[PDB]
Design a protein around this ligand. Sequence first.
Ligand SMILES: Cc1cc2nc3c(=O)[nH]c(=O)nc-3n(C[C@H](O)[C@H](O)[C@H](O)COP(=O)(O)OP(=O)(O)OC[C@H]3O[C@@H](n4cnc5c(N)ncnc54)[C@H](O)[C@@H]3O)c2cc1C
Ligand SMILES: Cc1cc2nc3c(=O)[nH]c(=O)nc-3n(C[C@H](O)[C@H](O)[C@H](O)COP(=O)(O)OP(=O)(O)OC[C@H]3O[C@@H](n4cnc5c(N)ncnc54)[C@H](O)[C@@H]3O)c2cc1C
Ligand SMILES: COc1ccc(CC2=NCCC3=C2CCCC3)cc1
Ligand SMILES: COc1ccc(CC2=NCCC3=C2CCCC3)cc1
Lengths: 450, 450
Amino acid sequence: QTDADVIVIGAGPSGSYAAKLLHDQGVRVKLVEAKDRVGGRTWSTKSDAPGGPIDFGGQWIGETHVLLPELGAELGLETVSSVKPGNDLFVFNGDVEVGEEDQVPSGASWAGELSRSFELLDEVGTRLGWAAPWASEHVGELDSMTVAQWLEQNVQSSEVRLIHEVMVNILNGASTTEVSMAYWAYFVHQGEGIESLIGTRSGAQVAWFIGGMGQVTELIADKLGDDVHLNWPVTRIEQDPTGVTVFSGERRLRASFAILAAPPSAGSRMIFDPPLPPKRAQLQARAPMGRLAKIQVRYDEPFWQERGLSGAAFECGDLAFWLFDGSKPTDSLATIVGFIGGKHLDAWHALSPNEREKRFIEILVNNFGDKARDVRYVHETDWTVQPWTGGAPVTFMPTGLLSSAGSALREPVDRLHFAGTEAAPMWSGYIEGALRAGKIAAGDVLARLA
Amino acid sequence: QTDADVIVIGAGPSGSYAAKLLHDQGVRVKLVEAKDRVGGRTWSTKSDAPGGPIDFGGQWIGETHVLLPELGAELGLETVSSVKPGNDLFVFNGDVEVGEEDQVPSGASWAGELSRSFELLDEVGTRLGWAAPWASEHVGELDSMTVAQWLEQNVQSSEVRLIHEVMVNILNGASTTEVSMAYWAYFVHQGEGIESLIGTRSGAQVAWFIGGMGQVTELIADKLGDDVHLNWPVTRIEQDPTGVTVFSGERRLRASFAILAAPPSAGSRMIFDPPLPPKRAQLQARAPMGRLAKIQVRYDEPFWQERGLSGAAFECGDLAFWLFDGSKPTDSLATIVGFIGGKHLDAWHALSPNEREKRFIEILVNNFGDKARDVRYVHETDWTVQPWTGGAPVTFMPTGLLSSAGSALREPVDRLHFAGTEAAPMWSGYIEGALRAGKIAAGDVLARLA
Ligand SMILES: Cc1cc2nc3c(=O)[nH]c(=O)nc-3n(C[C@H](O)[C@H](O)[C@H](O)COP(=O)(O)OP(=O)(O)OC[C@H]3O[C@@H](n4cnc5c(N)ncnc54)[C@H](O)[C@@H]3O)c2cc1C
Ligand SMILES: Cc1cc2nc3c(=O)[nH]c(=O)nc-3n(C[C@H](O)[C@H](O)[C@H](O)COP(=O)(O)OP(=O)(O)OC[C@H]3O[C@@H](n4cnc5c(N)ncnc54)[C@H](O)[C@@H]3O)c2cc1C
Ligand SMILES: COc1ccc(CC2=NCCC3=C2CCCC3)cc1
Ligand SMILES: COc1ccc(CC2=NCCC3=C2CCCC3)cc1
């Protein structure tokens, strides 16, 4: 006797979407979530902050994403463009260089090597591919070196190196000395290339949902009603010839199939009986979350526009950030958003909270002008302290893992299927990947139920 | 109101010893253990195997270890020498070279570069030190490269490279492409140097306890009686100004202090409230267990001695092992013990159990002669599937971790103290380190109780 046909573990976008698809087909589903809320690495509030809704986790929609906007539309959400005209900034340890709209500064001495380094990175990625990077003839060597070592071998300009360092410390939440070059190159390729991932005008970042990205999971949970269990951290998964038992301490739920819709690192904390196969066990134990914090400051007006600036800034150096204008036309205040990750976040953490806020204000003054001092609201979200997530924005891998265990990112283990964005064939790391992986897992399980 | 003065988490040698020391001073202690047994990575049975007691985990005592033999003596255990005279073997993808007792084969073409590579490794280790390797001026660069890269830069002989590869895959349970060179060099230095760790006649491996190493923890548990809780996996630690609450699901225990006597990876599965400081959180998430299996075959007699062989073999190559004669004079059968780790264990795992046993017998026949076919008993212990341990023999670290978070190996966090062998100033990775770290944590907590 079963409590459900399928138990879905994790109510982020991936698990919420898989549960929704199954429920929509009349499958009996339980969606169990460790935290006191749904959303996972997406998290927002319509009213807790002055000036309008605010997002604490992932919030941007890409121009080639389709599951995400279609889901949003189906749930009744409206999008607004996130694109910010004006001159983007490239800042090198406080020395500000002004782009031409989203392009490099006029006559920048580093533009040529930057373009060549991006082409080289894309070529490494293409040699690995998204379908099966672990099977590529080039992966063993690439997976035995770090991104930092690849930069040392292929980049000479300090500006280009610092741009690549901020890219990795942000988009993988980890230092170039920590991330396998094979993993990084695969990650960028399967996100449709480097221009896709760093473009402010076209690429993976062009729109937002009015009201916050957290709505997506909340609305799904609304419809699932009592089949959602919050405060239900899974501690053990047992399998047998006729189904799967999922435990939270002594609490238990029985089903025919289960879907793990959380990062490999989340699986590593669970006990499996029988034990998982070796590649999946190693993957869960050795693919950590990156580390990332998201600092937001609100103002009466987007005063950076007085200097003809977009508010986008690649703030490179010892305390590197990515900064953007996060303001929506329907907000009553303007918002600047700063992200800091990896080794830069390690440095940020070594400062006091007061020193951090003062340092960020000084960066905003340097980049955007003195009116940055007239703050209305300041907020920091440290993803490394969020229970049952423990980091951000994505999973990364150190040397040796992708080539020796990456095939376990997607393969089911008997009656346990894997969703979560890390399992997506493309757009792993992104909400779109969460949704694609949830769709795949739901389809596979539905086929086994028929 | 408290259940105990101190809660010790983990009943391996470290936590058992810390609980014992506290209890001996009249402190009220609880020792809580996740598994259905005490011992952790030590594990033995007096009677389940034909031919005498057998050890499934760590069992050797070193010549400079003192807490371990003194504890054994205090508990009523007797030691016996483990040293095996005869010619040790150095095997390179099946080509057997016969040592002169424990020394390299007469006139070996690789002897000179081997000695130089060992001296070089010791010198790297000495540059880092055991007291505070994370503070050494040399650690950032060393921690940004792998052991494999250091070998590529400093070793040319294939024999010497393969010897170093088996050393790392066994002693850290991980590939040379996975382990930070800084971590490996520090690990060897703090184990008193490479000759200490690989010597068959003098060094870290000279004696055993008759009856099995598991006795150490079992006897301690006997005296602690009902203050030991088995099947009590800690899932959450909460701290406040007056003490610490430790949870296993909904079950809870309250004390004034707690000691975590388990690897950083064990801590990563727990929820901490308040959250741990950043360096400790990163250390727990990013310092994995190595991977290791221990295969044992019993025979009527140590027939390898018919060829003048000790039974020790460094079996190098694609499927590398360390082999030793594990026979005690009081056993009624002879025992050969094989260890396989890291990338070699990955290969081992890709074979069927039957193919593994046949392959091991073929290795024994090649190395020691045809009588290896006349088996009496065969047993494998795969440490990667042991619940709440998940690997062996030790914790390792990938690039970037020791230099950015290693200072969190030993430092208490408010009322939570860290024991476990990884916290030992010296002999981290070994039972002696477990005991030293337990002694330190017990002393610190006792001082806070007075
Ligand atoms: C600051 C930040 C900014 C980001 N920006 C963007 C952006 O602009 N665009 C983009 O596309 N993506 C962005 N992301 C990434 C996006 O948030 C993730 O890709 C996405 O949320 C992945 O969804 P998921 O469902 O796979 O996993 P998650 O969102 O991590 O959900 C996993 C769920 O599993 C739960 N869980 C974990 N362990 C257990 C357990 N033992 N038992 C039960 N439940 C458990 C967790 O609590 C969580 O709710 C951002 C992320 C962060 C942190
Ligand atoms: C095959 C093998 C051979 C070895 N050979 C040797 C040798 O010859 N010499 C040597 O000196 N060392 C050897 N060792 C290493 C030695 O076993 C370890 O150094 C030692 O056991 C470390 O002791 P510990 O108490 O620090 O940790 P462990 O022995 O790992 O004990 C940790 C304990 O914590 C428990 N625990 C974990 N998570 C939780 C939780 N959430 N709640 C409650 N309890 C929890 C575990 O179940 C375990 O009992 C060997 C190890 C292996 C695997
Ligand atoms: C080039 O401009 C942008 C603007 C916004 C984002 C959103 C985003 N997506 C992936 C995860 C992450 C971020 C932003 C910062 C840190 C982590 C990305 C590129
Ligand atoms: C040079 O001879 C030996 C013999 C025995 C051991 C015991 C030992 N201690 C550290 C952990 C570990 C082993 C042995 C194999 C694998 C892992 C070491 C060296």
